[PDB]
Amino acid sequence: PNYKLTYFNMRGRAEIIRYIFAYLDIQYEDHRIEPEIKSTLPFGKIPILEVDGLTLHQSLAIARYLTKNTDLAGNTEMEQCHVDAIVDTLDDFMSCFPWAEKKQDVKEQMFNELLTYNAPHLMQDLDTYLGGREWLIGNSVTWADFYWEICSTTLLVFKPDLLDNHPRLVTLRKKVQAIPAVANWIKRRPQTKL
Amino acid sequence: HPNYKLTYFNMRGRAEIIRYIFAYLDIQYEDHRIADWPEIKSTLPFGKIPILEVDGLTLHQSLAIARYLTKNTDLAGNTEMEQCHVDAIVDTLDDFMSCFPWAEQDVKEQMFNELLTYNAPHLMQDLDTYLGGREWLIGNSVTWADFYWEICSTTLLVFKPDLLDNHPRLVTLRKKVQAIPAVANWIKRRPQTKL
Numbered sequence: 001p002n003y004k005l006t007y008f009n010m011r012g013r014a015e016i017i018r019y020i021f022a023y024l025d026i027q028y029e030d031h032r033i034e035p036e037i038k039s040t041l042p043f044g045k046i047p048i049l050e051v052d053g054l055t056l057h058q059s060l061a062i063a064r065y066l067t068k069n070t071d072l073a074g075n076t077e078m079e080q081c082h083v084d085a086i087v088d089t090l091d092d093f094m095s096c097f098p099w100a101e102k103k104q105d106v107k108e109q110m111f112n113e114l115l116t117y118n119a120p121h122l123m124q125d126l127d128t129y130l131g132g133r134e135w136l137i138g139n140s141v142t143w144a145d146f147y148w149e150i151c152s153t154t155l156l157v158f159k160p161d162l163l164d165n166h167p168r169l170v171t172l173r174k175k176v177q178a179i180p181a182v183a184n185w186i187k188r189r190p191q192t193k194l
Numbered sequence: 195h196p197n198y199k200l201t202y203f204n205m206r207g208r209a210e211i212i213r214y215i216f217a218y219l220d221i222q223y224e225d226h227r228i229a230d231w232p233e234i235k236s237t238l239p240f241g242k243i244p245i246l247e248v249d250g251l252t253l254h255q256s257l258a259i260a261r262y263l264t265k266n267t268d269l270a271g272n273t274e275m276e277q278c279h280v281d282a283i284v285d286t287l288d289d290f291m292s293c294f295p296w297a298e299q300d301v302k303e304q305m306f307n308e309l310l311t312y313n314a315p316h317l318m319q320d321l322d323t324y325l326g327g328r329e330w331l332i333g334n335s336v337t338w339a340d341f342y343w344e345i346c347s348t349t350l351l352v353f354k355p356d357l358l359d360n361h362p363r364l365v366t367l368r369k370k371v372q373a374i375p376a377v378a379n380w381i382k383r384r385p386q387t388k389l
């Protein structure tokens with residue numbers, strides 16, 4: 001099928017979809033914008049993915065759709081549940097940040113609270129969850145591992161010492177970044193802050 | 195057929211979608227409604243509820259759990275594409291409901307008022323538009339997105355009674371969900387809580 005991804009010029013919520021296309025070697029149009037386009041969207045939000053003239057929305061709904069019946073999905077139905085659960089736990093936390101807050105003091109207080117109080121607890125929980133295992137779910141890479149690497153990359157921009165106590169979580173990031181298709185995308189993609 | 199123990203507070207909240215699914219599929223489960231929380235919280239991999247214990251193995255994330263329980267059932271969506279549509283509608287609803295500062299007074303009251311007055315009507319319009327005159331939100335039969343629509347809108351109605359005054363078709367969909375026999379049976383029997 002013809003795939004057209006529409007999002008801002010940034011990694012953000014589209015990047016999980018971009019990793020998935022890269023890994024599965026699926027050609028797509030990576031359409032990066034830039035008030036007018038917002039009025040055309042089903043729920044006024046991006047990313048959207050057009051699939052042969054059908055408009056899909058919700059980054060994780062799309063990500064899950066693209067990984068159905070592929071090696072990035074969980075190998076069992078319970079593994080798929082763990083994959084979904086880890087992704088929503090990550091998405092929940094990232095969604096707490098006031099990305100679009102215009103008041104700079106309010107934004108700084110909230111980012112700081114989340115990074116200094118909430119984030120370390122989540123890192124601890126993820127590290128204990130991973131234990132000594134190779135990937136987050138099962139015996140091979142899933143799109144949960146991709147999403148960990150994507151979210152932690154952005155968190156590290158704001159809190160460089162985030163993973164100083166979690167070398168196993170750093171090792172996982174590096175393993176995702178070492179996957180040939182992912183490594184190639186990381187080196188060729190537009191360099192944006194977020 | 196596994197042993198299911200659902201752990202949550204004594205309320206509909208985020209556990210209710212799971213309770214609807216168990217009801218519709220006629221699955222026996224322990225509805226564990228919890229002073230007890232500090233101890234229980236300390237045993238959970240991610241410290242949040244709901245969790246679902248499946249033969250003693252702890253699953254978390256209400257929608258991950260709901261999706262798991264609906265796999266290979268008539269609630270999932272009839273194709274891979276419909277399954278995407280179902281997931282997208284559920285996340286759009288969850289996104290909005292998760293904006294509310296449930297655990298935050300004054301600032302809490304202000305944010306509720308803003309969300310309900312300024313944002314909710316926009317979302318209702320978009321949902322009505324998406325429904326597009328059809329009987330159900332995705333495809334030709336009920337999915338767990340319809341269940342979630344009914345659950346989320348029930349709670350929004352507690353705070354904003356006029357939520358659907360401009361959307362008769364959304365009221366009709368709620369009533370259709372509420373009339374599904376297993377759902378109707380659960381609605382009449384469940385503990386009565388505000389939220």
Ligand SMILES: O=C(NCCN1CCOCC1)c1ccc(-c2nccc3ccccc23)cc1
Binds near residue numbers: 012090100154
């Ligand atoms: O900066 C973000 N959004 C504002 C977009 N803008 C475009 C340019 O002009 C106006 C501002 C933003 C959004 C999303 C995320 C993000 N990244 C990775 C993962 C995420 C997961 C959930 C929620 C947000 C996530 C990070 C930053």
Ligand SMILES: O=C(NCCN1CCOCC1)c1ccc(-c2nccc3ccccc23)cc1
Binds near residue numbers: 207296345346
């Ligand atoms: O009030 C809520 N949660 C705090 C419950 N408490 C624990 C300690 O005892 C008293 C207070 C709450 C949480 C969740 C929802 C909720 N309902 C339906 C759907 C929802 C979807 C997303 C997020 C929240 C949702 C509504 C209310």
Ligand SMILES: N[C@@H](CCC(=O)N[C@@H](CS(=O)O)C(=O)NCC(=O)O)C(=O)O
Binds near residue numbers: 044
């Ligand atoms: N859970 C959904 C949220 C999308 C979203 O809110 N996107 C932002 C843009 S950016 O913060 O990713 C959005 O659409 N904001 C409103 C706007 O910019 O008009 C998803 O993952 O697709």
Ligand SMILES: N[C@@H](CCC(=O)N[C@@H](CS(=O)O)C(=O)NCC(=O)O)C(=O)O
Binds near residue numbers: 255257
């Ligand atoms: N996206 C997740 C959110 C779970 C959550 O934050 N749960 C709250 C309770 S609330 O639903 O009444 C929670 O467990 N908070 C931590 C606490 O209360 O200590 C889900 O849907 O399962």
Ligand SMILES: [Mg+2]
Binds near residue numbers: 092289
């Ligand atoms: Mg979510």
